[PDB]
Structure 1
Amino acid sequence: ATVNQLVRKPRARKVAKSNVPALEACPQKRGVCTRVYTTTPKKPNSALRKVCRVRLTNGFEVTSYIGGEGHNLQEHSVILIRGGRVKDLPGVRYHTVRGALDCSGVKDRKQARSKYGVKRP
């Protein structure tokens, strides 16, 4: 670009979009589970990974991951979601927060306890 071209039309900023639109720049949001089910991952990996569909307070309807071994969630369970992609599950951009509202901590966990909502033994 010449000087004269930039004077006529300046350099434009490329606009970056969020990976976590449904949060609307909140650190967490609350929602009611409408479905709780399992899903198989993409090619290299193999599993039955645990997920829920949740309707947030702001009207968005998203899929969230349920981390750790075993969970107590059902349809109509009130949970708190945070941001975080699960790489091998298409279109899962949110994690459930274990040990907040109706989501229990993981049974018998001893390491990384704060990440799974588990009180000190």
Structure 2
Amino acid sequence: ATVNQLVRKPRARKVAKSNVPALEACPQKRGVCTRVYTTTPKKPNSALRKVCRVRLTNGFEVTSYIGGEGHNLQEHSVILIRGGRVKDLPGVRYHTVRGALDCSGVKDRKQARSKYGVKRP
């Protein structure tokens, strides 16, 4: 406030940081993948959530959630990563794209198959 104060120091616009550091406004990104493993979520949930560390191509080292029931990911295996938090595993802030590269489609799925990368019956 005070118009003279604003002339002397203008309104600093709140530069809101991005949720997902995949960098340079990229839709998806390749990941070599290391340590595929299970993890427990926060309070009201309780499960064994399937998740992997992902050595990204640009240099970053991120965890990514593995959606669907069952997966082919292990040790290495090159996968594709898209954005999206899980909101349960604190730290996990990406999703593996099912269908793309070494990550295969979910077995025996019918409804909602673009998500989970499965072809027609």
* TM-score normalised by structure 1 residue count: 0.97
Percent sequence identity is 100
Show CA shifts across 1:59-116 (max 9, x none).
0000000000000101111000000000010011100000110001000000001101
Q: Secondary structure at the match of 2:52?
A: strand
Distance apart, 1:23 and its partner CA: 4.2
Distance apart, 1:24 and its partner CA: 3.7
With over 3 angstroms needed to count, the CA separation of the structure-2 counterparts of 1:119 and 1:22, relative to structure 1, is same
Show CA shifts across 1:23-55 (max 9, x none).
442000001111100000001101000000010
Q: How does 1:98-113 map to 2 (within 5 A)?
A: 98-113=98-113
Give the alignment's Cα RMSD to 1 decimal: 0.8
Q: Is the 8 A contact 1:41 1:47 kept in 2?
A: yes
With over 3 angstroms needed to count, the CA separation of the structure-2 counterparts of 1:106 and 1:23, relative to structure 1, is farther
Structure 1 Cα separation of the partners of residues 75 and 59 of structure 2? 17
Structure 2 Cα separation of the partners of residues 112 and 69 of structure 1? 13
The alignment covers a number of residue pairs equal to 121
Query: Tell me, which stretches of 5 or more residues in structure 1 are unaligned?
Result: none
Q: Secondary structure at the match of 1:21?
A: coil
Structure 2 Cα separation of the partners of residues 19 and 72 of structure 1? 28
Structure 2 Cα separation of the partners of residues 113 and 89 of structure 1? 24
Query: Tell me, which stretches of 5 or more residues in structure 2 are unaligned?
Result: none
Q: Is the 8 A contact 1:23 1:29 kept in 2?
A: no
Structure 2 Cα separation of the partners of residues 101 and 108 of structure 1? 19
Structure 1 Cα separation of the partners of residues 23 and 78 of structure 2? 16
With over 3 angstroms needed to count, the CA separation of the structure-2 counterparts of 1:19 and 1:36, relative to structure 1, is same
Structure 2 Cα separation of the partners of residues 6 and 23 of structure 1? 34
Structure 1 Cα separation of the partners of residues 4 and 23 of structure 2? 43
Q: Secondary structure at the match of 1:5?
A: helix
Q: Is the 8 A contact 1:40 1:47 kept in 2?
A: yes
